[PDB]
RNA sequence: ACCCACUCGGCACCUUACGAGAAAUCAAAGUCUUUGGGUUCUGGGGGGAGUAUGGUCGCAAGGCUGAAACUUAAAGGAAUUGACGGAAGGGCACCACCAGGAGUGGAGCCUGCGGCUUAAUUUGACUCAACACGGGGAAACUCACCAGGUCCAGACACAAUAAGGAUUGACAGAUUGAGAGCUCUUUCUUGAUUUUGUGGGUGGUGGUGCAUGGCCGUUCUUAGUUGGUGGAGUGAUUUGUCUGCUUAAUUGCGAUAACGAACGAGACCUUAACCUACUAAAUAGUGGUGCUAGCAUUUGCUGGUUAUCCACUUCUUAGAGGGACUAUCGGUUUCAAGCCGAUGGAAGUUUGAGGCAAUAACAGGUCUGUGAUGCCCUUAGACGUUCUGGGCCGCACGCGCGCUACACUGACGGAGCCAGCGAGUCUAACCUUGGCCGAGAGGUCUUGGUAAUCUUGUGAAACUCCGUCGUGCUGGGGAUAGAGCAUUGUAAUUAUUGCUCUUCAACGAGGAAUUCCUAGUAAGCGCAAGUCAUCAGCUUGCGUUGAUUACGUCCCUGCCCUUUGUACACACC
C-alpha cells in the first residue's frame, strides 16, 4: 500500500484528574454539618448531587448536561 | 480418504438404491487440489427423471489446511416409486404371451 | 481400504438394526420474581431545600 | 521361340505356425531347464571414452591394439495407451463460406476499455471465451479511492491500578466543517460495568482464484463413456466401439470374432400451435329478455344499463383426456436404414423454441456475493467502523458495444386507430382512473385495486387516411449553448430528470476492413419487467408490421474424426 505520513501532534484520551474531593461539607466542632456546594432540584437527582461552581454558572453533573441553574 | 468415501457408497447401496455416487473435492495434505468420483451401480444424469428419482447434496467440510467439497448422488430405485412414476421413460417391458393348444375342431357349448 | 470400508458398512448395519429394537425441580421464575415480592426490600426518602 | 510335367541349383515373394521370441517379428531368429553335431569371433549396467598411455603402421589425415581414477540408479529394447505435429485422407456449421439482407467501420452524442491527468480520479477481466461484462444506470449511501474528524463494537485468562475511588459522562467557553466534552479550560457526575500490561481473540471490498470450497465460463451449434459372456495378446491392451451408407446425433442400416446391454444423444420435461368432444365460470364472455337512448320507422339499425331475471360455453380461462407415428400413395436407395415429392392434416425442418445434459480437461473467471475458507498481512496515529467533503464523470487522444440521422418508401400538421409479456400499498404511502387548474412539464380534490375484480381495452409505436413543405445542408438533422418554469431527493454546483423559448454544428450513404442472420426468421416498431427516491441511449422477455436470398458446398476461417511420426506423459507453455 503506503503506509504512514503523520504531521506529528498524535492525540490524547483524558485523566478524570485525581481529587481526594469529598471534603465539601463542613463540620462544627462536635457535630454540626453545614454543606457545601449547593444541591439540585431536579427529582431525578435526589439532593445528594451537587452543582459545579464556575464563573455565572452552577452545573449539575449528575444530569450528565442538564439544566443550567445560576445563582 | 477412501475407507470412507468407500464406506459411504457401500452403506449407500446396501440400503438398496438403484446407484450412487460420491465426489471428494479439494486440498488432502498436499498443496494442490484432487478430485475423486466414487461410484457404484446405476445413475441417469439427464432430462426430468433427474428431478425425480436422484437426491444431490454438497457440503464443505472446513479443515486445517483447507476446505473439502463433498458431492453425494443417489438414484432411487423406480420401482419403489410409491407416489410417482414407477420406472424410467425408457423402460418398454412386454408381456408374454401364451403357449396355445389348438385344434380341437369347432364345436360349441351350453348352459 | 476396500475392506476396511466393507466393515464399516458392516458396523452402519449393527447400529441400524440394534437401535430398531434395542433396550419436579419447580418455583418457575416469574413466580419466584412473585414470592419474593413480599418486600420489606427498599429504602426512600430526600428533596429538601 | 513357346506350352505342360518333373528334377537339380539360384535371386525372392506368398500363406501357415507344429515351433521360437520381451515383443516387433522369424523356414530360421525352429529342432533350447526334455539345456551337448563341428568350429571361429565379440559382449558382461550407464558415463568416464574409443579418452589417456605404450607399441605399431602411415607422407599426412589418421588406422590396429587400448586402460584406469572418478562418477552414477539408471541408461536401454520392443510393444500399449494417451497427448502433440509447421504429415496425409475424410467430415460438420451463416459464432464458415455460397446467394443475399440489415448493418457496424465514416459523422454527432451515449456508453465501456486503454491512455493521459489527478489529492483520489478504488478495483477485477485483455483473442473466439476482456471492452452497455462484475447484473457496474456511483450526487449521500453504495465505496473499496483521496483530504480530514470520532468510536471499540479490543471475546476470554492471568496480572497491575484501585473503594481514601478502578472507571464514565458533560452544560458554556475555547476549539472544530459541525449542536463531537476530539482536545483544552472549570468542577460536577459516575461506581468496579472499565482502565493499563502481557497472552489470546476479533474485524478487514487488505493479499494470494498460482493455497481451496462452491458457482460459473470454455472445450461443446460437440458425440462421446463404460461394463457382461465370447475372440486376440505373457502383458499393458485390443475386438465389441467398423470400410461404406444414413442421421442433428456411437442416429441407424449394413459389414462383421463378436453377441447382447447400460451412461450420454434419444426418451423426458416446459412453452407456443389444434379440440362447436369432457367438467365449469357476476374476478371471463355470448345470445334472449325486461328498463332504456338515438336514427328510422313495416318488423329494422346503433348504443346505455356488476344481478331485474332465463339459457348457453363458440370466443377467454385451465383441469382431465384426445391428437402425429414424418400417416396415405408414389419416387429414390445395397429396394436397407433413410431421403425426396404429392395428398390429406391444427401440426410433418428433432412440429417450432427452450429446460435438463455423461466422462474429461483449463493453474479460464470469481477470496469484490456469502458469517464458505487455508496461509500471509493489519489490528487503535486501524487496512476495523462510522461522520463531513471530494472522487469513480476528471480530457491533446487510440479501441469496442450502442443511440440519432444524412430525408420525398420523408419530415411536419390534422385525422383514423390496433397488441402481447408484465407489475403494483401493512402495519404502508406501491400501481393510479376520474374532477378541476396549468401552454407544457406539473399541481390539486377525490377514487378502485393485496388485483382475470381497479390502473388497463395498458386507445404503444411503426402503420393507414387528408393536407402543408418541394429538393434547396430545406421545414432533412438535432449536437452545442443561453435564458426561464417544474419534479425526485436532507442534498441537484461538475448542470439527476422533465417542460418552454432561442441557439441550428457534424453528417449529401461512409477506406482498409468486419459483425449478424434462412420464416412470422431478418429487419423496421414500440412496450413491460430488471436496476430504480430520481435517472435507459443497457439488458431480460413481449407483441406489432413483415421481406429479399440459400435449402448448397469445403474456397476462406474454425473445430471434430481417422491414418502416421514421436526421444513428449508435469504431455509442445
Ligand atoms: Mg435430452
Ligand atoms: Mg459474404
Ligand atoms: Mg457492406
Ligand atoms: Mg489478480
Ligand atoms: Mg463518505
Ligand atoms: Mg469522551
Ligand atoms: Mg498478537
Ligand atoms: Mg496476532
Ligand atoms: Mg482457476
Ligand atoms: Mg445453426
Ligand atoms: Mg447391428
Ligand atoms: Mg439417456
Ligand atoms: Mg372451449
Ligand atoms: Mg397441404
Ligand atoms: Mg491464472
Ligand atoms: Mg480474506
Ligand atoms: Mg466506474
Ligand atoms: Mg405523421
Ligand atoms: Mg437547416
Ligand atoms: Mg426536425
Ligand atoms: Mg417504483
Ligand atoms: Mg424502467
Ligand atoms: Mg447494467
Ligand atoms: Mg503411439
Ligand atoms: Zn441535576
Not at chain 1, 32 to 45: F, I, M, Q, Y
Not at chain 2, 11 to 35: D, F, I, P, Q, T
Request: net charge positive; hydrophobic share 40%; glycine share 6%.
Amino acid at each position: 500500500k503506503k503506509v504512514y505520513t503523520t504531521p506529528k501532534k498524535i492525540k490524547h484520551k483524558h485523566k478524570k484528574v485525581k481529587l481526594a474531593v469529598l471534603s465539601y461539607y463542613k463540620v462544627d466542632a462536635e457535630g454540626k454539618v453545614t454543606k457545601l456546594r449547593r444541591e439540585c432540584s431536579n427529582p431525578t437527582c435526589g439532593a445528594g448531587v451537587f452543582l459545579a461552581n464556575h464563573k455565572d454558572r452552577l452545573y449539575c453533573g449528575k444530569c450528565h448536561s442538564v439544566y443550567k441553574v445560576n445563582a | 480418504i477412501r475407507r470412507a468415501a468407500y464406506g459411504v457408497v457401500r452403506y449407500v447401496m446396501e440400503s438398496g438404491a438403484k446407484g450412487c455416487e460420491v465426489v471428494v473435492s479439494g486440498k488432502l495434505r498436499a498443496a494442490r487440489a484432487k478430485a475423486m468420483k466414487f461410484a457404484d451401480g446405476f445413475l441417469i444424469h439427464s432430462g426430468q427423471p433427474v428431478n425425480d428419482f436422484i437426491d444431490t447434496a454438497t457440503r464443505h467440510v472446513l479443515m486445517r489446511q483447507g476446505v473439502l467439497g463433498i458431492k453425494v448422488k443417489i438414484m432411487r430405485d423406480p420401482a419403489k416409486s410409491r407416489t410417482g412414476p414407477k420406472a424410467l421413460p425408457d423402460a418398454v417391458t412386454i408381456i408374454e404371451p401364451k403357449e396355445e393348444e389348438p385344434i380341437l375342431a369347432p364345436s360349441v357349448k351350453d348352459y | 481400504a476396500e475392506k476396511e470400508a466393507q466393515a464399516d458398512a458392516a458396523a452402519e448395519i449393527a447400529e441400524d438394526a440394534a437401535e430398531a429394537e434395542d433396550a419436579x425441580x419447580x418455583x418457575x421464575x416469574x413466580x419466584x420474581x412473585x414470592x419474593x415480592x413480599x418486600x420489606x426490600x427498599x429504602x426512600x426518602x430526600x428533596x429538601x431545600x
